[PDB]
Design a protein around this ligand. Structure first.
Ligand code: NAI
Ligand code: FMN
Ligand code: SF4
Ligand code: SF4
Ligand code: SF4
Ligand code: SF4
Ligand code: FES
Ligand code: FES
Ligand code: MG
Lengths: 217, 42, 230, 431, 62, 59
């Protein structure tokens, strides 16, 4: 429904144009490679990758990072502001170490995803969009994540967890709290979206090179 | 053959893998074309 | 020469290649409704108020952005175009605030006049309207962003005519807002023209606020003497 | 000639490494026949490739179903002075669809080879892949496959013993479904907001960076080299006329075994679910409605889904459209209006807001559907919502407004009595 | 309040053409100044010009 | 429904209801209303002049 996040920036002691931010030299090499990807005279096309790199280096996007990207790519700062406020993967506010996103679209909602949502609610003791006090987890409800067949599923810091049950999310959460990273992929041992007991496709070994090339080639 | 899953390589991907691969492939590209000027605002 | 023949309500007219439907209709003497199109700005195509029916074409086209093709018959007063105008006006007025008595652009509003001339006479919107917070861009332009219809005329003017890239859109969908995203005064020698180009009372003259109504004023055509341009 | 479809042999499928069971790297792709006689395809010329694609009867796999050969011939105009590019749409935005994700992470080399073949056919200097930002491991797999391709000389400097130069770049988005739209895809590549632009001018004339451009789906790009290798007529054999080939189908929702499978085109819907999905939960009698093409396409009830096929024309005859071949089923033990309202909420949250009809009307639709779910409305408002959907559809800049209006239209048309009953129950309960 | 002394302060007339107005003014004995009609000149609009490959007309946002 | 002497009303809080929209002055068949306005010290839209000539009014 309603968003709840403001699209206007107000100066804050920890978020202001004087907030310290800069690029580490290897990030600068990555930036120059990204710029080299596009045709000359169209440098800006690199606003999204450079901004994403800044977010990955810092964890979130302060206004100072936005201005730094704008001055590096020589584009008006308002353009970077529009890019950052348009796309939803950019964090304009500090976010926890483990950013948990739970898909609640209709295909995922059909396979009992609200139960997993409330299980995370109970396990962490924080609301749908709040952050745990120790700055370790942040829960966010998102749209389709491209894993409809593996519903229900969650996405935590670029890793996909699929075919979850409530219990499974408690093991994921407490393993993350322990310190190690749980393995990405579907649960129940179904191995990336085949029928659980069907296996109705791709059983016979694939044919070799040039199995059916037509004449004249 | 089939029973083994062969996509576990992504289980050890860092946060900088994509950009590092981009940097590595930067030396394999053609020289980019040029529109004539440094920027449309120029 | 290189002119092509097109028809506006069955009347033939010769137009240059690349001429859009709106200018072809202008050559006949009809003004297509518009909110986002301005002659001296780049074409945007946002307000969709210029949707007109081409004969033997199932889909309406944007007269402001669609170049005309040879042999086209533009049906401006067709039933489909009227229905499209009514729908677009309904969507425009769904979230507009009931600010007309307190709005400085009461008797000179393109929204009001085009609603009277091309829209319906009643509403069927039973929801609650949206309200966005006002911005501050200096002591010259008063901002009441709730009235904004997101036509993006001010952004295009600032970017192209004034050469200032301060204005833009932030957000997505319903709560997309026009502004600067930071407390910043849009200052230029041509800054006051965004008051004129804004069709609604979202941008208004601050020193002129609340003093008069358009129907009362008398118009005297004179020459500026503040510089040598005249 | 053929009347019954739905039996596709294991050796006769396109994506033999769909499930990631075999090596997804250059060695495994070579073992499965990838990059075989590719130099011959490059040297044969673009006209032959375009003819093979046209005679193959391949249609746009994105969802629209536009003949791909027609677009690739539109792009085949002589040189102008500007570089020419090929754009692969890997956004995969639509709900209930995962086909692009599986054929990228588990088989990138077919995508790379298709990119090269399409670039040669259309004279593209380089190919840009706009992979979804959330697909990070998939993007890394694609990039390492491209790295292997450069090492093997399959793409890059002359790409072959051919004399043709071609580069493949991968760019990433940031959580924006509207960026899947081809013009919005181009805008996002150019570093602006993902707001679609108006047509004309079409991408072939003015596309990315203002250069001629062609946007093609991941599946369409990936199938093309196999079409060139095995012949257009072979692909024309499958399915009915004007519906040639094979399609990837994703079955999700209330089924025993949710899965994605590659199968013949004109499979019956009931046959597909019973064969590959393991059947709908609780038996075929438990089925209430199914959405065939993903979120954008309108839902159909049991009676018409009993004997409906999977192709463009027949599903249009069912007033739905094939869409993206994303099957979502709903039994009779679920709140159907709740699901449709959730879809409308998703469309509300994913619109860019550039034009007034989509923005205002879709927000209005979300509010109206939220009120319908609780039954707080009146029976006379159903026709009002139908008229709102009519006003939205066909008047927006892009097709997202149409894709948000269609589910409401289908839900009204097929379940008006349910809405009326819910409103009556709410009125009785509140007096 | 605002007072006046000229009875012609609110008199405005409408004419189809400039010649009609000139004839009316001449036959009524009023000295007149005539201003030629200003017409907005035609303009070349192109939506594709917004997305220019090398031209400056390329827009930053839309 | 009887029409008598004119009066300006105000809200229960005590602030005047008039917002200087000038609709009454525009509609007046006898041109008996004269209105001038400006922003108030608190920024409210209020009148500084509101005259009705009752020897021109037709009630
Ligand atoms: N794969 C996914 O996740 C998603 C798929 N979709 C599907 O996309 C469909 C609509 O997409 P559109 O691109 O708007 O369909 P469209 O009919 O407008 O165009 C489809 C393709 O045909 C080209 N084309 C069409 N007419 C042309 C012409 N006269 N000249 C040159 N080229 C022409 C277009 O350039 C475009 O590339 C929807 O039905 C939806 O099912 C929608 C969202 C997500
Ligand atoms: C709102 C919207 C979102 C879309 N998202 C995608 C997408 O994520 N992936 C895709 O391949 N096509 C998507 N499309 C359809 C594209 O227009 C399509 O890919 C493009 O026209 C080329 O399709 P083709 O390869 O089948 O010819 C989307 C269309 C719309 C209207
Ligand atoms: S902008 Fe026009 S329609 Fe909106 S409140 Fe002001 S006068 Fe009324
Ligand atoms: S403030 Fe006025 S000119 Fe600017 S976008 Fe809004 S309505 Fe258009
Ligand atoms: S229909 Fe919606 S998503 Fe598409 S351009 Fe218009 S506002 Fe944007
Ligand atoms: S100006 Fe006249 S019509 Fe307007 S609020 Fe004041 S009294 Fe009422
Ligand atoms: S519905 Fe959950 S990933 Fe698409
Ligand atoms: S005037 Fe054409 S869409 Fe606005
Ligand atoms: Mg104004």
């Amino acid at each position: 429904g309603a968003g709840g996040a403001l699209f206007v920036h107000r100066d804050t002691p920890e978020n202001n144009p004087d907030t310290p931010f800069d690029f580490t030299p290897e990030n600068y090499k990555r930036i120059e490679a990204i710029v080299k990807n596009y045709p000359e005279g169209h440098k800006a096309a690199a606003v999204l990758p450079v901004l994403d790199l800044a977010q990955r280096q810092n964890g979130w996007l302060p206004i100072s990072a936005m201005n730094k990207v704008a001055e590096i790519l020589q584009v008006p700062p308002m353009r970077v502001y529009e890019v950052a406020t348009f796309y939803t993967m950019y964090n304009r506010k500090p976010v926890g170490k483990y950013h948990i996103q739970v898909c609640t679209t209709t295909p995922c909602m059909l396979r009992n995803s609200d139960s997993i949502l409330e299980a995370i609610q109970k396990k962490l003791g924080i609301k749908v969009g709040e952050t745990t006090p120790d700055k370790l987890f942040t829960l966010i409800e998102v749209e389709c994540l491209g894993a409809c067949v593996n519903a229900p599923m969650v996405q935590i810091n670029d890793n996909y967890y699929e075919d979850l049950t409530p219990k499974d999310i408690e093991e994921i959460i407490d393993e993350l709290k322990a310190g190690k990273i749980p393995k990405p992929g579907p649960r129940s041992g179904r191995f990336s979206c085949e029928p659980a007991g069907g296996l109705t496709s791709l059983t016979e070994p694939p044919k070799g090179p040039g199995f059916g090339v037509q004449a004249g080639l | 053959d089939n029973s083994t899953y062969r996509n576990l390589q992504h289980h050890e991907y860092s946060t900088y893998t994509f950009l590092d691969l981009n940097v590595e492939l930067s030396k394999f590209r053609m020289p980019q074309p040029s529109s004539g000027r440094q920027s449309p605002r120029h | 020469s290189n002119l092509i023949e097109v028809f506006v309500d069955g009347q033939s007219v010769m137009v240059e290649p690349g001429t859009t439907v709106l200018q072809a209709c202008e050559k006949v003497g009809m003004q297509i409704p518009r909110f986002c199109y301005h002659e001296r700005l780049s074409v945007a195509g946002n307000c969709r108020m210029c949707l007109v029916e081409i004969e033997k074409a199932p889909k309406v086209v944007a007269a402001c952005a669609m170049p005309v093709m040879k042999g086209w018959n533009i049906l401006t007063n067709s039933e489909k175009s009227k229905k499209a105008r009514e729908g677009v006006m309904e969507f425009l007025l769904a979230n507009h605030p009931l600010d007309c008595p307190i709005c400085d652009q009461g008797g000179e509003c393109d929204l009001q006049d085009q609603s009277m001339m091309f829209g319906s006479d009643r509403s069927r919107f039973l929801e609650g309207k949206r309200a966005v917070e006002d911005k501050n861009i200096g002591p010259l332009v008063k901002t009441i962003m709730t009235r904004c219809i997101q036509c993006t005329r001010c952004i295009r003017f600032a970017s192209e005519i004034a050469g200032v890239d301060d204005l833009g859109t932030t957000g997505r969908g319903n709560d997309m807002q026009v502004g600067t995203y930071i407390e910043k005064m849009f200052m230029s020698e041509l800054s006051g023209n965004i008051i004129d180009i804004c069709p609604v009372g979202a941008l208004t003259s601050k020193p002129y606020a609340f003093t008069a109504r358009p129907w009362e004023t008398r118009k005297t055509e004179s020459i500026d003497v503040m510089d040598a341009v005249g | 000639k053929k009347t019954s479809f739905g039996s596709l042999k294991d050796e006769d499928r396109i994506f033999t490494n769909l499930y990631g069971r075999h090596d997804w790297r250059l060695k495994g792709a070579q073992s499965r026949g990838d990059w075989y006689k590719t130099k011959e395809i490059l040297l044969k010329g673009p006209d032959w490739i375009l003819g093979e694609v046209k005679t193959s009867g391949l249609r746009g796999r994105g969802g629209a179903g536009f003949p791909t050969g027609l677009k690739w011939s539109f792009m085949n105009k002589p040189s102008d002075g500007r570089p020419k590019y090929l754009v692969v749409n890997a956004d995969e935005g639509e709900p209930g669809t995962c086909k692009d994700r599986e054929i990228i992470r588990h088989d990138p080399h077919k995508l790379v080879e298709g990119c090269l073949v399409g670039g040669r056919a259309m004279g593209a200097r380089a190919a840009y892949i706009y992979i979804r930002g959330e697909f990070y491991n998939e993007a890394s797999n694609l990039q390492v496959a491209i790295r292997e391709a450069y090492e093997a000389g399959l793409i890059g400097k002359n790409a072959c013993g051919s004399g043709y130069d071609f580069d493949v770049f991968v760019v990433r988005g940031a959580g924006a479904y509207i960026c899947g739209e081809e013009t919005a895809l181009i805008e996002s590549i150019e570093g602006k907001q993902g707001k679609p632009r108006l047509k004309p001018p079409f991408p072939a004339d003015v596309g990315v960076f203002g250069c001629p451009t062609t946007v093609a789906n991941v599946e369409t790009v990936a199938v093309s080299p196999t079409i060139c290798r095995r012949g257009g007529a072979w692909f024309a054999s499958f399915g009915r006329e004007r519906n040639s080939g094979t399609k990837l189908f994703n079955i999700s929702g209330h089924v025993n075994h949710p899965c994605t499978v590659e199968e013949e085109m004109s499979v019956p819907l009931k046959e597909l679910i019973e064969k590959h999905a393991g059947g709908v939960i609780g038996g075929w009698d438990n089925l209430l409605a199914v959405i065939p093409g993903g979120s954008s396409t309108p839902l159909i009830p049991k009676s018409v889904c009993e004997t409906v096929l999977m192709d463009f024309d027949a599903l249009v005859q069912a007033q739905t459209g094939l869409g993206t071949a994303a099957v979502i089923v709903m039994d009779r033990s679920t709140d159907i209006v709740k699901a449709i309202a959730r879809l409308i909420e998703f469309y509300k949250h994913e619109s860019c807001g550039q034009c007034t009809p989509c923005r205002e009307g879709v927000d209005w639709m979300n509010k109206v559907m939220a009120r319908f779910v609780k039954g707080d409305a009146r029976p006379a408002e159903i026709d009002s919502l139908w008229e709102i959907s009519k006003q939205i559809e066909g008047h927006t800049i892009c097709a997202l407004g149409d894709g948000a209006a269609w589910p409401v239209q289908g839900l009204i048309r097929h379940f008006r009595p349910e809405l009326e009953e819910r409103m009556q129950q709410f009125a009785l309960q509140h007096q | 309040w605002s007072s006046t002394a000229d009875p012609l302060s609110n008199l405005v007339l409408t004419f189809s053409t400039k010649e009609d107005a000139v004839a009316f003014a001449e036959k009524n004995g009023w000295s007149f100044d005539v201003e030629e009609r200003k017409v907005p000149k035609p303009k070349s609009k192109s939506y594709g010009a917004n997305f220019s490959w090398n031209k400056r007309t390329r827009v930053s946002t839309k | 429904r009887f029409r008598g002497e004119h009066a300006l009303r105000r809200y229960p809080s005590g602030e005047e209801r008039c917002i200087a929209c000038k609709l009454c002055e525009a509609v007046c068949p006898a041109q008996a209303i004269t209105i001038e306005a400006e922003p108030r010290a608190d920024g409210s839209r209020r009148t500084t002049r509101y005259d009705i000539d009752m020897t021109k009014c037709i009630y």
